[PDB]
């Protein structure tokens, strides 16, 4: 039902350099899909 | 934390056959792009294959291509290597390692030299006994 | 109708530190590309250093990473190479070109030879006095 | 089925050199792998050299070192066997044996005596004042 608007523009100039940017962490691992507008920031061991 | 340790190698003979494993004890594979890098003796470490993060996507170089054979498997989490037709000069110590996401091969980026973030110990691969 | 003058250069020492400027008489930057080339004594002309249209894209040749900066201001309509930690084989006429459009890295291409359309007339720098 | 037809031989003295030449009519020659073995009067027959199915890999005796050179052309699919220096003790019949496979050194396993499923018939070489 979103009312918004969406702005994106490309950053390879300050976000990345030859070693590699490691500061941005995506997370793969969660136990049940998130509720809309909802984040989850604790660290805890995901076995398979 | 992430620890990419290497099983096999050891004594074999030209013409024969020998199995490498590398099983990560971080963090797991069909995520992270691995490959595999040798190191001849008195020589620069050059790789020599690798397997994408998605699907079964393989690379191989223009000296060893046919030979040998890459291949993984998800649940034992470990990457396997099977060598095939073992000639005289590919006494190397043998290296496995691993990055985020589809790095060989990626748009006009191959894996060129040594651009992974992770490195392993290594094993010593000796012919010709 | 479109000029480019070449400002800087001097006598000074090995290891020392310069600035050099790149102005545009007709069009304007920061909608054309543009980039830097050298000229040695009895060496054919080659490349330094390019930049695109937009943003802050930024590129070097192979034996010239770590040792030059680039930056350009559309306030002052003009270009600053600087120049850091120089060496004796660093002496040639430094030429400044611009081109419409980001051709720096443009796809499957860089910016090889000297493609590029407007010209400027340059400076002579030299080293080791 | 398959016959194996050796030729050469004759009168040698020490210090000459002779080529014996092996033609299988049936089997194909670089996929399968032949040698040679001798037999002395009095003795118990013992191997000369060897080549793989895999391209010219050679094997050798410890007798035979430096003296005894083995080729294989598969144009008119006949292997040579080529020797120099004979001394006063190499007097012996020759047979040429093919096994399919990469028979020889494969593991655990030399071309020790005669387990080869292709035979032929022998030459004489002797040699004397």
């Known amino acids: 039902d979103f009312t918004g608007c969406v702005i994106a523009w490309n950053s390879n100039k300050l976000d990345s350099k030859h070693s590699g940017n490691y500061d941005y962490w995506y997370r793969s691992f969660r136990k049940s899909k998130l509720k809309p507008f909802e984040r989850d920031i604790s660290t805890e061991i995901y076995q398979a | 934390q992430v620890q990419l340790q290497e099983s096999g190698g050891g004594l074999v003979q030209p013409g024969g056959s020998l199995r490498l494993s590398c099983?990560?004890?971080?963090?797991?594979?069909?995520?992270?792009?691995?490959?595999?890098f040798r190191q001849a003796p008195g020589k620069e470490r050059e790789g020599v294959s690798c397997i994408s993060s998605g699907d079964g996507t393989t690379y191989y170089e223009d000296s060893v291509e046919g030979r040998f054979t890459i291949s993984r498997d998800n649940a034992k989490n470990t990457v396997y290597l099977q060598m095939n037709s073992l000639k005289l000069e590919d006494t190397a110590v043998?290296?496995?390692?691993?990055?985020?996401?589809?790095?060989?091969?990626?748009?006009?980026?191959?894996?060129?030299?040594?651009?992974?973030?992770?490195?392993?110990?290594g094993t010593q691969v000796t012919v010709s006994s | 109708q479109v000029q480019l003058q070449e400002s800087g250069g001097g006598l000074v020492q090995p290891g020392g530190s310069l600035r050099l400027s790149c102005?545009?008489?007709?069009?304007?930057?920061?909608?054309?590309?543009?980039?830097?080339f050298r000229q040695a004594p009895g060496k054919e002309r080659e490349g330094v250093s390019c930049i695109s249209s937009g943003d802050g894209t930024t590129y070097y040749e192979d034996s010239v990473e770590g040792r030059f900066t680039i930056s350009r201001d559309n306030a002052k309509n003009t270009v600053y190479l600087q120049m850091n930690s120089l060496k004796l084989e660093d002496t040639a006429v430094?030429?400044?070109?611009?081109?419409?459009?980001?051709?720096?890295?443009?796809?499957?291409?860089?910016?090889?030879?000297?493609?590029?359309?407007?010209?400027?007339?340059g400076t002579q720098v030299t080293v080791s006095s | 089925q398959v016959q194996l037809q050796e030729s050469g031989g004759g009168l040698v003295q020490p210090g000459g050199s002779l080529r014996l030449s092996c033609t299988a009519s049936?089997?194909?020659?670089?996929?399968?792998?032949t040698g040679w073995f001798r037999q002395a009067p009095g003795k118990e027959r013992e191997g000369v050299s060897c080549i793989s199915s895999g391209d010219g890999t050679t094997y050798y005796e410890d007798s035979v070192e430096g003296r005894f050179t083995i080729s294989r052309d598969n144009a008119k699919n006949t292997v040579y066997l080529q020797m120099n220096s004979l001394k006063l003790e190499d007097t012996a019949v020759y047979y040429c044996?093919?096994?399919?496979?990469?028979?020889?050194?494969?593991?655990?396993?030399?071309?020790?005596?005669?387990?080869?499923?292709?035979r032929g018939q022998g030459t004489q070489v002797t040699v004397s004042s």
């Open positions: 049936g089997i194909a020659l670089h996929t399968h792998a």
């Open positions: 044996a093919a096994d399919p496979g990469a028979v020889c050194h494969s593991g655990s396993y030399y071309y020790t005596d005669d387990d080869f499923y292709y």
